[PDB]
């Protein structure tokens, strides 16, 4: 429900600031390590709920190699959580491997939808 433009706005304000980065980024790294989605072979851009038109648009515009890789990570996480185990520590997602790949497509489709809404609700200055 929260827009990804809003998350990117707040996150870019936190990352550009020198005090807020050094204060809140290690807490976020520890939050992501404790969340433990990487222990099932998942990046975060697979965790996003894909049942909305913005996310369906982003998954349609995602290229094919990223799509097959994301599909394999989702089926691997389903088999792993079926077995009630974790992935072996050689197969965990590394921190350098957890890159936002779906985020530009999400933000682009989001900007397109917000422009569509703003043009549907204009008032021409007359």
């Amino acid at each position: 429900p929260q827009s990804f433009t809003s998350i990117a706005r707040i996150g870019d304000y936190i990352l550009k600031s020198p005090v807020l980065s050094k204060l809140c980024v290690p807490v976020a790294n520890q939050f992501i390590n404790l969340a433990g989605y990487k222990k099932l072979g998942l990046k975060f851009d697979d965790l996003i709920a894909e049942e909305n038109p913005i996310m369906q648009t982003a998954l349609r515009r995602l290229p094919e190699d990223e799509s097959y890789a994301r599909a394999y990570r989702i089926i691997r996480a389903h088999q792993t959580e079926l077995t009630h185990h974790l992935l072996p520590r050689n197969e965990w997602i590394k921190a350098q491997e957890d890159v936002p790949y779906l985020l530009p497509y999400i933000l682009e489709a989001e900007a397109a939808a917000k422009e569509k809404d703003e043009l549907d609700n204009i008032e021409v200055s007359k």
């Binding site: 433990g36 799509s67 097959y68 599909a71 394999y72 009630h84 185990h85 974790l86």
Partner: protein
Amino acid sequence: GPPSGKTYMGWWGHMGGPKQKGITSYAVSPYAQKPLQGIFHNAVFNSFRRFKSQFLYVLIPAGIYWYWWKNGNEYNEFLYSKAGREELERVNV
């Protein structure tokens, strides 16, 4: 029949997930397997892994509310005793 709305689940054949190439499934017959394989190892080791990862979220708030309830129960039992009737009428009136 009439068509329903756009749903996020199809049926067997047209589920609505993405296209899949390269993911290959392997599954051997249960009649060739051992059910109850690993139940003693996963009974004491995997169970401790799951409990160790997921017990602070369940044991800090349970301890918080149980200590709050025990403290309130002891304060009530002190209030309606003979030693604490002055405090009883003070906090009651």
